[PDB]
């Protein structure tokens, strides 16, 4: 149960 | 090193265009959000809108009702944010900003100061 | 519709005091599920661009020193600057991200009191 407004699969964090 | 190099301050009259830039660097740009935070005086920053560059994912606040738009150049690792009809009420300092998963800003420019005035 | 609430406006604290900085969310900004409170914290400094200092309300960012602490949960938070030196003068704000639109608080002006 993931709660991230601006979630991506393939978002590379920094 | 994290990047954010914004273009410099404008003046502009009511009715005019704009288009501000801010283009990243030290960083995946296409896999990252980058945004736009507005500051005016008299309240706290204003959240304006965010996009994802690799898919054009774009989230606006819906207080800036249609006012504004939010775009990117992968080619160039640029994001814009362009008016097409400025207002008085538009003169602020505009941050562009970095966010991931969860909306919390991790990185901001330095801004650009955005005069409108007859 | 988060409504993001701070006070004071302005704080002037001694050299090597204590500020402790609030801000109020209209709603909570609790997930039950991560038992996590989405709530930032930035610090700008006169003349410069605003720097995040805590998220999650109270896990610092690299670099941050320990004297600068987040607390709460729900709706009412605090940031506390255990021993201020002259370079924490800044303008404090508060940032709810649980959900959309992004809303910050008022800002807290923090000064030097002689």
């Known amino acids: 149960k993931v709660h991230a407004l601006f979630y991506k699969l393939d978002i590379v964090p920094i | 090193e994290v990047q954010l190099v914004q273009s410099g301050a404008e003046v502009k009259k009511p009715g005019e265009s704009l288009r501000i830039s801010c283009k990243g660097s030290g960083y995946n740009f296409t896999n990252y959000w980058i945004g736009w935070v507005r500051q005016v005086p008299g309240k706290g920053p204003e959240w304006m809108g965010l996009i994802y560059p690799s898919d054009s994912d774009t989230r606006y606040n819906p207080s800036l009702q249609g006012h504004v738009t939010i775009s990117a150049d992968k080619s160039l690792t640029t994001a814009y944010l362009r008016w097409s009809s400025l207002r008085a009420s538009d003169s602020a300092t505009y941050y562009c900003?970095?966010?991931?998963?969860?909306?919390?800003?991790?990185?901001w420019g330095r801004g650009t100061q955005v005069i409108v005035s007859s | 519709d988060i409504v993001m609430t701070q006070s004071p406006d302005s704080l002037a604290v001694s050299l090597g005091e204590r500020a402790t900085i609030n801000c109020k969310s209209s709603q909570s900004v609790f997930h039950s599920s991560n038992n996590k409170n989405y709530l930032a914290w930035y610090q700008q400094k006169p003349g410069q661009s605003p720097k995040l200092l805590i998220h999650?309300?109270?896990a610092r960012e690299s670099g941050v020193p320990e004297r600068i602490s987040g607390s709460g949960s729900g709706t009412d938070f605090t940031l506390t600057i255990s021993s201020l030196q002259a370079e924490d003068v800044a303008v404090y704000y508060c940032q709810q991200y649980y959900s959309t639109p992004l809303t910050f608080g008022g800002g807290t002006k923090v000064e030097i009191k002689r």
């Open positions: 900003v970095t966010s991931g998963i969860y909306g919390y800003l991790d990185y």
């Open positions: 999650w309300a109270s």
